[PDB]
Amino acid sequence: TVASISSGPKHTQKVPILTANETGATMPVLPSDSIETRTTYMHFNGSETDVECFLGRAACVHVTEIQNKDATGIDNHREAKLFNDWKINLSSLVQLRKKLELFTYVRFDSEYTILATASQPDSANYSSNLVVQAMYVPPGAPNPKEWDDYTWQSASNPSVFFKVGDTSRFSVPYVGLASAYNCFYDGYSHDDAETQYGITVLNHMGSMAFRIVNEHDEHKTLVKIRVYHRAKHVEAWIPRAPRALPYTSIGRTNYPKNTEPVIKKRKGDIKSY
Amino acid sequence: TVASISSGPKHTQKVPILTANETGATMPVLPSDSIETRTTYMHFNGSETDVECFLGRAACVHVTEIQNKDATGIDNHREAKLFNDWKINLSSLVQLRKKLELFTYVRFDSEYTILATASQPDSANYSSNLVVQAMYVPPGAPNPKEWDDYTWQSASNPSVFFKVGDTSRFSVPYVGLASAYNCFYDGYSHDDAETQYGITVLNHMGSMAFRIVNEHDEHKTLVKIRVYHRAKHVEAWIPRAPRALPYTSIGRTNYPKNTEPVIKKRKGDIKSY
Amino acid sequence: TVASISSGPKHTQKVPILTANETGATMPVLPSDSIETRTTYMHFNGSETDVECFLGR
Amino acid sequence: GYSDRVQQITLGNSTITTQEAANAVVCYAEWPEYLPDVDASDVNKTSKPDTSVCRFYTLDSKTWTTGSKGWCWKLPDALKDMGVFGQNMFFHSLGRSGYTVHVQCNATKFHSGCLLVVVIPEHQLASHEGGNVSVKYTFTHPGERGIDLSSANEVGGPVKDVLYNMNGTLLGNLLIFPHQFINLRTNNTATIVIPYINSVPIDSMTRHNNVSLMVIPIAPLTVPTGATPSLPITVTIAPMCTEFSGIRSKSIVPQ
Amino acid sequence: GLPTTTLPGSGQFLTTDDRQSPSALPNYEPTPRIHIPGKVHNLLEIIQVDTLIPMNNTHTKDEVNSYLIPLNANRQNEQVFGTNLFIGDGVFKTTLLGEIVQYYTHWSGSLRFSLMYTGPALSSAKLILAYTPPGARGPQDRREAMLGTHVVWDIGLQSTIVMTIPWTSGVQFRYTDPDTYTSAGFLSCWYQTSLILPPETTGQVYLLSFISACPDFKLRLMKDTQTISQTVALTE
Amino acid sequence: GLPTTTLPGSGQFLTTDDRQSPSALPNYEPTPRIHIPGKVHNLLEIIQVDTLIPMNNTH
Amino acid sequence: GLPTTTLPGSGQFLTTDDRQSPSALPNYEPTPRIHIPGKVHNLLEIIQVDTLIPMNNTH
Amino acid sequence: INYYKDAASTSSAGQSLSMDPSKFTEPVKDLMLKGAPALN
Amino acid sequence: INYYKDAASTSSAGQSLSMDPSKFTEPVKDLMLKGAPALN
Amino acid sequence: INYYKDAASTSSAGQSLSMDPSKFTEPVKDLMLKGAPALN
Ligand SMILES: Cc1cc(CCCOc2c(C)cc(-c3noc(C(F)(F)F)n3)cc2C)on1
Numbered sequence A, B: 001t002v003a004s005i006s007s008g009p010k011h012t013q014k015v016p017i018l019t020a021n022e023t024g025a026t027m028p029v030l031p032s033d034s035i036e037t038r039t040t041y042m043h044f045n046g047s048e049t050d051v052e053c054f055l056g057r058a059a060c061v062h063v064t065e066i067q068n069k070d071a072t073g074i075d076n077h078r079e080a081k082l083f084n085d086w087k088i089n090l091s092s093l094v095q096l097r098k099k100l101e102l103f104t105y106v107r108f109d110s111e112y113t114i115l116a117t118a119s120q121p122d123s124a125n126y127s128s129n130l131v132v133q134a135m136y137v138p139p140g141a142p143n144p145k146e147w148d149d150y151t152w153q154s155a156s157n158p159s160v161f162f163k164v165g166d167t168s169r170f171s172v173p174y175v176g177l178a179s180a181y182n183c184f185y186d187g188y189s190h191d192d193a194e195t196q197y198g199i200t201v202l203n204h205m206g207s208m209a210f211r212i213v214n215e216h217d218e219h220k221t222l223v224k225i226r227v228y229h230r231a232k233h234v235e236a237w238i239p240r241a242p243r244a245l246p247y248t249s250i251g252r253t254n255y256p257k258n259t260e261p262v263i264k265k266r267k268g269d270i271k272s273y
Numbered sequence C: 001t002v003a004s005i006s007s008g009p010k011h012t013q014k015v016p017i018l019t020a021n022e023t024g025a026t027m028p029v030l031p032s033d034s035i036e037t038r039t040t041y042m043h044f045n046g047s048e049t050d051v052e053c054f055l056g057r
Numbered sequence D: 001g002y003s004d005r006v007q008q009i010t011l012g013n014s015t016i017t018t019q020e021a022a023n024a025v026v027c028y029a030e031w032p033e034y035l036p037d038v039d040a041s042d043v044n045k046t047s048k049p050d051t052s053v054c055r056f057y058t059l060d061s062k063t064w065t066t067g068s069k070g071w072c073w074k075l076p077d078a079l080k081d082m083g084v085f086g087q088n089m090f091f092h093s094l095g096r097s098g099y100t101v102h103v104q105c106n107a108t109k110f111h112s113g114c115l116l117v118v119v120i121p122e123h124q125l126a127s128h129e130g131g132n133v134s135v136k137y138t139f140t141h142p143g144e145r146g147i148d149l150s151s152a153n154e155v156g157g158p159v160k161d162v163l164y165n166m167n168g169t170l171l172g173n174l175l176i177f178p179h180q181f182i183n184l185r186t187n188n189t190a191t192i193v194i195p196y197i198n199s200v201p202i203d204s205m206t207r208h209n210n211v212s213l214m215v216i217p218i219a220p221l222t223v224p225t226g227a228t229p230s231l232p233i234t235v236t237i238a239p240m241c242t243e244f245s246g247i248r249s250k251s252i253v254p255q
Numbered sequence E: 001g002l003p004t005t006t007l008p009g010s011g012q013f014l015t016t017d018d019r020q021s022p023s024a025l026p027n028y029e030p031t032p033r034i035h036i037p038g039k040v041h042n043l044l045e046i047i048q049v050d051t052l053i054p055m056n057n058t059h060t061k062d063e064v065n066s067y068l069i070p071l072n073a074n075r076q077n078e079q080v081f082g083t084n085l086f087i088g089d090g091v092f093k094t095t096l097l098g099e100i101v102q103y104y105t106h107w108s109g110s111l112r113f114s115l116m117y118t119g120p121a122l123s124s125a126k127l128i129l130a131y132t133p134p135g136a137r138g139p140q141d142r143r144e145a146m147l148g149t150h151v152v153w154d155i156g157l158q159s160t161i162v163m164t165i166p167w168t169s170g171v172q173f174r175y176t177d178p179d180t181y182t183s184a185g186f187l188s189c190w191y192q193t194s195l196i197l198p199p200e201t202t203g204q205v206y207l208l209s210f211i212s213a214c215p216d217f218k219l220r221l222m223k224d225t226q227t228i229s230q231t232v233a234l235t236e
Numbered sequence F, G: 001g002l003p004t005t006t007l008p009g010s011g012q013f014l015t016t017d018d019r020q021s022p023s024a025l026p027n028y029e030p031t032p033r034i035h036i037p038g039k040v041h042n043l044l045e046i047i048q049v050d051t052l053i054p055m056n057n058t059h
Numbered sequence H, I, J: 001i002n003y004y005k006d007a008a009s010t011s012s013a014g015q016s017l018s019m020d021p022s023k024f025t026e027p028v029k030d031l032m033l034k035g036a037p038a039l040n
């Protein structure tokens, strides 16, 4: 594959470098169209910039917390973090979000990796070997209310049991209801004057609940859970303007008020180098 | 393959042992050219002295430290070692450096092995199971400022998560901008009267940040991180004089002042055995 | 596998939507039996509802 | 003597001519088409009114002044009240359509100004309030009037900073979307053919706007000495390959 | 039992590894694909589309005006604009090219820089765009700029001039992150003759500048960008 | 010894995974199958049978 | 699940072992090779070049 | 590839791919044709 | 070799190797030849 | 057998088995034959 062909002097009626950008087209002008060039080869395929590679690596998409402690007298297990849940979404942590939002529609399979790390902030005689249970609770499935509900039986919901300090790994097929996931959605759930706007109404993927299976020890253990997402078998459509301003909320395109200029201001002239 | 051929008496006009080293050549004179020899075989290929083998084993290239402790009130996480980073280079530890510097240009793939070991210098009721995160921060990527920045999301930067006491392993393709890495560079970044001299301006490979994912425990844990490098698929060019004097800095060929003689001095005559 | 066949207007003596449930049978009436339909495909096998899968976790 | 500048577009009983065009853009190089069986899900036979809805409808003219920020229309919203197309929109549960957008603006060889005409699929607007505030239905359904980017914020409405495309992205990058410029010195019209773009075969035409059309002044308007400091901008849109499905009662929408 | 020996790295989680993993939803049948226009396969595809450069940084805040390059009537020899060519910073940092380029550490290839005139039809002008390859300073006058790669642009019927910035370098790749040894040079524009306005016409005409990559373009070593961040996880 | 590298997820128990496992009752011979009417293969089979709708909730 | 038995030495890091390992930079395309004179393949190649001996240590 | 001697130790069977609702939907003695009067 | 029954569990797809920027760079109705006047 | 997609992840190359010291030992313009006077 040639990068540049050999091209010499020129004196024509054919002017490749004069165009009309109001047509909306970006004419494929090459260096050999405006200067004398020599032959060079690409020695390059562009593998690393393939959308499969671009979205094909794990990125942290959520961090949450649960803890192992005596549940005696706790009236709201959920609030006490005896167990916690995550309303599944990929737009909470901004790094992966900006990448995905480089496109309008996106379709792919997902590979999840869940890392659980223990912590004992105050006096403990040892570190306990806790087992985490991550259960997927799809829309319509009964949500856990107590860390040891009948819901954790998980007869139909899928769930993994892994050691804290260890990692959990599994993949999920493309689960969108449509032919592709929407990164943006200029619409509502119905024609209502007050209903929510944006993908907020589209990305209703249920949530996944986490808990520590072990009963409590004398001391209290804080387990932090990090979920990583890697896309595979990727397809992307309709490229768009990259995000410029900071995000403020999951799902909305909203940006903060009194935000700072994102375009750098010259320390001098428009003639400055 | 013969090591020596059979060679008998000699009385010629052909004098193989008389040469002129000012030509700059080292004539391939053999024992059979100056003495009577018998036939012997090599029974040797020279596998172990192949550059692929010479640079093909792991060598420690860096040792650093991070620690798990309460970050509350710490104004500079980096300084407190809540996380630390390594400005990637292979000339900090001298053993591998001298080997690589046996050549001028060198090209190869790299296999890294990262070993993390824990230590609890003062009172601790147990040893915690910490998980280390090593993230590669290429030039231009945002550097972590706090041990739990958004930067550790590592959406595009590659990173590994492994247990302390365990080891991390992965390989990296030849990432030089040129066709080979320079072990030496008699130049600057630009024609400037004060700019730096040497490979210091060439080997700008970014750095890799290390941190402990776990929140703090009651006691403090000191984690020492050792990075090992093994070259594979090696190519080397322009052999040079081995280093004689001790090194003083990363990248420069500088040697200390008032250094000791490196050539041994005879305990006697030039006639001494 | 077609999900729905193309079906147009209708004016027959053949009334597929009139049955007698006291027989105990559930006649396989389709949308194309009561409305005008277009052709669509299943693109679906029903793997996940196989008893092997249902009790298989 | 055929030129990129002279064109005629005939849809239904409506025809458009322009003697100062700059070619025409066909979004992602795809001409609109009807929904093929292989992609269909909804089993209902669809209705294709053809020429009674696939024709040019001219919106109310806007006035480009030295201080204009820009305008934003949404489809199919902007045509929600246009003849039979509009009626079908509310009488059916589902619908799908493509369009030919034709923006007009003439001046003289003494004027100067440059409008960016761009089509943005799934243009999800942002709330000027930031945080997690939503943008109420009415404010993204301005209809034929469209949204005036120089108008003041209003409770429940979207942010209208031209610089940030009403969505947190920079104006300069709007060119990644199918667009065209109306550079008075060259142009006087912009034409963009839009194929149906969505993650579903067919969809509700009232609760979802597939794309929004934006006419944004980049190089400000300049009129010759002592001339009227304004120019009109006219938008004409024609639906094409329009399909409606699931006919019934007729929606009653917010406000 | 097959005898095995586990190697260093066992149990590690390399975010960049590409392995197989069990499916949590066995026998699930995903939704059929339907045709959707505008499919993107490679980022190198979209960086070939040019976007506007906010060449006129000079303002106190982000404005439509930062994209307008002012041109002044009856000025001779003078400079219209200038900029270094660190495509991963400065004026380029927010463009689609600069934005995508920042997702990678290395870049190589030729850049496509365009200028579209928006002044009145009855006006005229001849400008000169110049690219100064690394090794010397940014040109300080037309004569100096003219000695390097350049294009004399005659404003007219065809509104846009496309000047290529041919890959001129020794090392075959450069860092997207501004690095001196790896500098790309300078870009400048000057009046070849001058801008002439017609009667009854007054003020300023502007130039719109665009940037995009040539099929020449190469990008490698993926990394996180400095163009986005957060202090706390976002919530609904 | 075959060199190996264990991957993330090792040791996990995914209730949804479908692997092989040793039999706790080797050589056990299960009872012969006999014909039994009414075999069900897919739930999509039985939902095609209609049942009564308690349309008159009101009580 | 393939039944296996881990052998002594598992988990060890022998600096001298030569195994495969996952690449941290998938799809990265390294810079083309260009011709560079003076390539060295074996150290036995260069020791055949003679250098000066500091025979007169005495200083 | 199966690693164990007993059948019970193998993994899941894979889709029956039979599917005949009629034994539940149309368990009638006299065949009833769609369109023909249910009770003649 | 694939160890799992479902497609979703396989590893990455491998380079699309299609690459056609024209649907974004030249989405014009009338073909424009490089060198020929953009506006004739 | 290689388990990974990238070349960088494979193990060591194996002996070059080229070995030509002459480019360092005899980089002279005019060939010098062993036995013939070095300076004729
Ligand atoms: C955009 C976009 C795309 C997606 C896909 C979300 C996938 O949702 C899941 C997740 C996150 C996990 C599981 C899952 N299956 O088993 C487990 C367990 F191990 F966590 F229990 N988790 C299943 C689905 C459908 O979400 N937002």
Ligand SMILES: Cc1cc(CCCOc2c(C)cc(-c3noc(C(F)(F)F)n3)cc2C)on1
Binding pocket: B088, B089, B090, B110, B112, B134, B135, B136, B158, B159, B160, B170, B172, B175, B181, B203, B205, B208, E014, G024, G025
């Ligand atoms: C001379 C010379 C040659 C080199 C090569 C340095 C390679 O730089 C790296 C390193 C050290 C690690 C990674 C890396 N990728 O993933 C990880 C993680 F696991 F550490 F995160 N580290 C990537 C590159 C390009 O540096 N100096």
